[PDB]
């Protein structure tokens, strides 16, 4: 039937949308094609940790696979699975790997909690048509408060073995003149202090983070979303996903939406219609939903800049052998706390997360997931024939992001006399990996695509809202920029549009 407006997914730009909508008293419908995750599994917990990987952790895959870096121990632990609706969905196109979550929440259910916006000058650099006072005197910081941002205390993660990952990575960058920071997060750091002393149920301390936490992790189901759904006005569907979008010949738009079961198996197919429309489907998924649209016919006013635009955030992987000395122990809380901050805007930029591993025995790695300033992007091109957007990225479009990830490393290994590790990610010698992306940014850019408040170009109250706006690049994790242009950008169109 209808509904006023129509929200497509429940990730950071959906939820935030969402919320305002309905404070505005605008009857709401989200339509998320994942599930609703609350219903406890076989183990009495909603999540799989990385420990014991089975259908949850996947969404229609035929085996678990190891998170990325951690192979070589956790191999052993996979297994055989059912295709079923599982939270976390690698989506392969030709040269590059894109993580994605699914479910109510989206990508807030797998990650890392790391909540860090992004350098000012930068923000000015990658989106020079948007008001950066605004920015960062309003939308940052309701961002912030939203998300329910909190801060680890020092004095617990000095002392803590859960931590002592991150410290030995400081000590070993120190030696080479690079500095670290603190990384806000939402997961509670106060319920990890009661982990770590045996008072609450584990869950980051318990080898969960990418396959959802069953506790201590303020995914957005907890805030934006359990607020939108507060407001009386907004409701959820799951298991809906939209394949097609129109403009009718009345007005507004009008969505065929596949509801399927949990196992895949198509129930019903309907047609939803609606007077305002916001796309929330991610980086991969809004860009799909359009250049669909529009090589299809549907949305024939849709410009060419539709599609363009991808960056990976210039994710690079990499790992350091350490001394024999210098453990990094084997608990390791699977949230990080600590980034080294090399990021001055120039072409070597980097910003690397000091990343946990999941092992539960001693192996001397250290892992990074770095951040870098690449200026190659992909294009999300349709192929009518399979129905499907192909991501047109090739792996050689990485090498500027391995090469900045590389010098900064190679000073660390120069100060420290220590090596690379080559065999984390294949058996081919590779300390680079160079085809994965966590943090997809691009396809629907804000101003290109778009106006600068994420109107869709060629179209009345047609809206995208998410990661598909941002530019390539942020130099920091990505959600919380997200978060706060997707708050400028709903408060701006509910003004002037709604
Ligand atoms: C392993 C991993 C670690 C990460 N760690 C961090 C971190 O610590 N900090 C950070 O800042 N970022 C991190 N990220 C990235 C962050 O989660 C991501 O940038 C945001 O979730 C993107 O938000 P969007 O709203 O664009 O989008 P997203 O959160 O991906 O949500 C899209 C939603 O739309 C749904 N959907 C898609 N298509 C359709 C359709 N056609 N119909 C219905 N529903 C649909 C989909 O299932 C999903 O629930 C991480 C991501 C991963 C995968």
């Given at each position: 039937g209808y509904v006023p407006a129509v929200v497509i997914g429940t990730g950071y730009g959906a939820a935030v949308s969402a919320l305002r909508l309905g404070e505005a008293g605008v009857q709401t419908l989200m339509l998320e094609m994942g599930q609703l995750w609350?219903?406890?599994?076989?183990?009495?917990?909603?999540?799989?940790?990385?420990?014991?990987?089975?259908?949850?952790?996947?969404?229609?895959?035929?085996?678990?696979?190891?998170?990325?870096?951690?192979?070589?121990?956790?191999?052993?632990?996979?297994?055989?699975?059912?295709?079923?609706?599982?939270?976390?969905?690698?989506?392969?196109?030709?040269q590059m790997s894109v993580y994605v979550g699914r479910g109510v929440g989206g990508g807030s259910l797998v990650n890392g909690g790391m909540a860090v916006e992004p350098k000012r000058s930068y923000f000015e650099e990658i989106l020079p048509r948007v008001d950066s006072s605004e920015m960062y005197d309003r939308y940052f910081p309701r961002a912030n408060s939203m998300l329910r941002v909190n801060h680890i205390d020092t004095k617990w993660f000095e002392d803590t073995e859960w931590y002592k990952?991150?410290?030995?990575?400081?000590?070993?960058?120190?030696?080479?003149?690079?500095?670290?920071?603190?990384?806000?997060?939402?997961?509670?750091?106060?319920?990890?202090?009661?982990?770590?002393?045996?008072?609450?149920?584990?869950?980051?301390?318990?080898?969960?983070?990418?396959?959802?936490?069953?506790?201590?992790?303020?995914?957005?189901?907890?805030?934006?979303?359990?607020?939108?759904?507060?407001?009386?006005?907004?409701?959820?569907?799951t298991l809906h996903q939209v394949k097609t979008i129109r403009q009718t010949k009345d007005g507004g738009y009008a969505?065929?939406?596949?509801?399927?079961?949990?196992?895949?198996?198509?129930?019903?197919?309907?047609?939803?219609?609606?007077?305002?429309?916001?796309?929330?489907?991610?980086?991969?998924?809004?860009?799909?939903?359009?250049?669909?649209?529009?090589?299809?016919?549907?949305?024939?006013?849709?410009?060419?800049?539709?599609?363009?635009?991808?960056?990976?955030?210039?994710?690079?992987?990499?790992?350091?052998?350490?001394?024999?000395?210098?453990?990094?122990?084997?608990?390791?809380?699977?949230?990080?706390?600590?980034?080294?901050?090399?990021?001055?805007?120039?072409?070597?930029?980097?910003?690397?997360?000091?990343?946990?591993?999941?092992?539960?025995?001693?192996?001397?790695?250290?892992?990074?997931?770095?951040?870098?300033?690449?200026?190659?992007?992909?294009?999300?091109?349709?192929?009518?024939?399979?129905?499907?957007?192909?991501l047109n990225w090739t792996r050689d479009q990485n090498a500027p992001a391995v090469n900045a990830a590389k010098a900064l490393f190679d000073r660390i290994n120069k100060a420290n006399g220590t090596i690379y590790r080559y065999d984390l990610f294949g058996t081919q010698l590779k300390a680079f990996a160079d085809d994965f992306c966590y943090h997809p940014l691009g396809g629907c850019v804000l101003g290109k695509a778009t106006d600068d408040y994420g109107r869709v170009a060629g179209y009345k109250n047609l809206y995208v809202t998410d990661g598909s706006l941002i530019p390539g690049s942020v130099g920091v994790n990505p959600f919380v920029t997200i978060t706060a242009l997707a708050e400028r950008n709903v408060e701006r169109i509910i003004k002037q549009d709604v």
């Open positions: 609350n219903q406890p599994g076989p183990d009495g917990n909603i999540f799989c940790g990385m420990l014991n990987p089975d259908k949850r952790s996947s969404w229609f895959k035929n085996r678990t696979e190891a998170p990325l870096g951690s192979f070589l121990w956790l191999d052993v632990v996979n297994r055989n699975i059912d295709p079923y609706a599982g939270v976390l969905d690698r989506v392969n196109y030709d990952f991150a410290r030995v990575s400081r000590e070993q960058a120190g030696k080479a003149g690079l500095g670290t920071v603190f990384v806000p997060n939402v997961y509670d750091f106060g319920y990890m202090q009661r982990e770590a002393a045996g008072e609450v149920p584990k869950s980051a301390l318990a080898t969960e983070v990418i396959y959802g936490n069953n506790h201590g992790k303020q995914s957005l189901d907890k805030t934006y979303l359990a607020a939108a759904l507060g407001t009386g006005k907004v409701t959820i569907q969505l065929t939406v596949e509801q399927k079961d949990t196992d895949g198996k198509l129930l019903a197919t309907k047609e939803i219609s609606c007077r305002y429309l916001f796309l929330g489907a991610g980086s991969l998924g809004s860009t799909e939903l359009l250049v669909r649209a529009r090589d299809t016919g549907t949305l024939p006013n849709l410009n060419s800049e539709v599609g363009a635009g991808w960056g990976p955030n210039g994710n690079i992987m990499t790992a350091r052998a350490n001394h024999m000395w210098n453990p990094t122990g084997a608990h390791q809380s699977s949230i990080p706390a600590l980034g080294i901050d090399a990021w001055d805007n120039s072409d070597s930029s980097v910003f690397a997360e000091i990343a946990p591993m999941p092992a539960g025995l001693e192996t001397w790695v250290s892992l990074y997931l770095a951040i870098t300033k690449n200026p190659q992007r992909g294009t999300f091109v349709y192929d009518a024939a399979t129905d499907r957007a192909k």
